[PDB]
Ligand binder design. Structure first.
Ligand SMILES: Nc1nc(N)c2ncn(Cc3csc(C4CC4)n3)c2n1
Length: 167
């Protein structure tokens, strides 16, 4: 038993809700919140900009030190950093950005990072400003993630479309 509430159950291990990942995180304090990161951990907009703002820019400060030490992530890769006031940990995952021409097949590699964590609150990778089809992203999530994932979908219209079209 865990503290997530109001989710619809899609599969054995995948759950979905129309919600603000920022407010969902501050209420739940999940062990892991997933950020829709880029390779530079520049948290300027979308989910990343929202999460970073909610941390009072502490996420960005920590991320800049990470990059200065380690260099950029790979597309499809991830790193674990602090969750600040939102979660114990933040798993920064780089899905391919279609608006940069990145290969959508790396979306499966991106979701594989979730399997290193037993339970996660997450957005749909490569959705929103990353330019992928959120319905494809949901299918890849369901077919790749085996751990327990709670997906927060900000847009109510999109949430209803994801549920109604789910096979
Ligand atoms: N659940 C939730 N909460 C927010 N506050 C929010 N903002 C943008 N998106 C959609 C989204 C999913 S992946 C993504 C980035 C790759 C660009 N953007 C949001 N989803």
């Amino acid at each position: 038993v865990n503290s997530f509430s109001g989710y619809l159950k899609l599969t054995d291990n995948v759950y979905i809700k129309n919600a603000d990942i920022v407010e969902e995180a501050k209420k739940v304090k999940p062990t892991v919140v997933v950020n829709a990161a880029n390779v530079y951990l520049k948290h300027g907009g979308g989910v990343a900009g929202a999460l970073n703002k909610a941390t009072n820019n502490a996420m960005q400060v920590e991320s800049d030190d990470y990059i200065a030490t380690n260099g950029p992530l790979k597309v499809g890769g991830s790193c674990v950093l602090s969750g600040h006031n939102l979660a114990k940990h933040c798993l920064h995952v780089v899905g391919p950005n279609v608006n940069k021409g990145e290969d959508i097949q790396l979306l499966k590699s991106a979701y594989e990072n979730f399997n290193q964590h037993e339970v996660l609150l997450a957005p749909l990778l490569s959705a929103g400003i990353f330019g992928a089809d959120p319905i494809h992203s949901l299918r890849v999530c369901v077919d790749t993630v085996r751990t327990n994932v709670y997906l927060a979908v900000f847009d109510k219209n999109l949430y209803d479309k994801l549920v109604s079209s789910f096979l």
